Amino acid sequence: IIGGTESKPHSRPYMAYLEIVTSNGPSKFCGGFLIRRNFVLTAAHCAGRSITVTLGAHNITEEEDTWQKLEVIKQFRHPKYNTSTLHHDIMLLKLKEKASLTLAVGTLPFPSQKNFVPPGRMCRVAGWGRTGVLKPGSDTLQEVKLRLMDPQACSHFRDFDHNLQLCVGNPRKTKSAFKGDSGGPLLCAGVAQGIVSYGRSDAKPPAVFTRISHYRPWINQILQAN
Numbered sequence: 001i002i003g004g005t006e007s008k009p010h011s012r013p014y015m016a017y018l019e020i021v022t023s024n025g026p027s028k029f030c031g032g033f034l035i036r037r038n039f040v041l042t043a044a045h046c047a048g049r050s051i052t053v054t055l056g057a058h059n060i061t062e063e064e065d066t067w068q069k070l071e072v073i074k075q076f077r078h079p080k081y082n083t084s085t086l087h088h089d090i091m092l093l094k095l096k097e098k099a100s101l102t103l104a105v106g107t108l109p110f111p112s113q114k115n116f117v118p119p120g121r122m123c124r125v126a127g128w129g130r131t132g133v134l135k136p137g138s139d140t141l142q143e144v145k146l147r148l149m150d151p152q153a154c155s156h157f158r159d160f161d162h163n164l165q166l167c168v169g170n171p172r173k174t175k176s177a178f179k180g181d182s183g184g185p186l187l188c189a190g191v192a193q194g195i196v197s198y199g200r201s202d203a204k205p206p207a208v209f210t211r212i213s214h215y216r217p218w219i220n221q222i223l224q225a226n
């Protein structure tokens, strides 16, 4: 998160910290969010050979009683995810057991409504990602308020599509999701409407988020069958 604030500790109890293992490099990291006691939603580009989930964190360097370190038993990457275009950048993680409900750990289920969110409003995104181009990942959960932009603001991303994705962050400001924030939720009036997907290496906003409303049928299908 660039240009944001430290979150009040445990104030976003659905937030998930993901460690992603591959066979031929060290760990990579993403965010995510708990939508059922045994399901985390995140980005498809966060898939790996194996994933660990930590719920209940604020400072990810200091173990505390709120932590729940949970095993993932299966990854459900969107079947039409495209590594070239990055269309359909969405994935569900099924946890081996249901998480415990505590003050610091809780679900964020979707409301029944799945209305298309137009440009114009402010929304908030949280993550443990880098706080600038040359800066390491944050040890503490950070958050920032960002403007939903008209789709023409994201035209330079030649594979961006308005139907599939949100365009997030006023280009006149530095405020943005960035590397290490992948898979984290964008909340608009307390409702998850986006997932951090990608943007520019040089951090100039806007960035591209998966538009959750488009994927609600798929999410429902996976949850009901598993």
Ligand SMILES: CN(C)C(=O)Cc1c(C(=O)O)n(Cc2cccc3ccccc23)c2ccc(F)cc12
Binding pocket: 020, 028, 029, 030, 045, 046, 047, 177, 178, 179, 180, 181, 182, 196, 197, 198, 199, 200, 201, 203, 207
């Ligand atoms: C498992 N991970 C994490 C990786 O493989 C590295 C990775 C990241 C990242 O580091 O988070 N992001 C997000 C990202 C990248 C570049 C610039 C961005 C500017 C804004 C927002 C997000 C940005 C990816 C998007 C597509 C992809 F195929 C891979 C990645």
Ligand SMILES: [Zn+2]
Binding pocket: 009, 010, 058, 064, 066
């Ligand atoms: Zn604590």
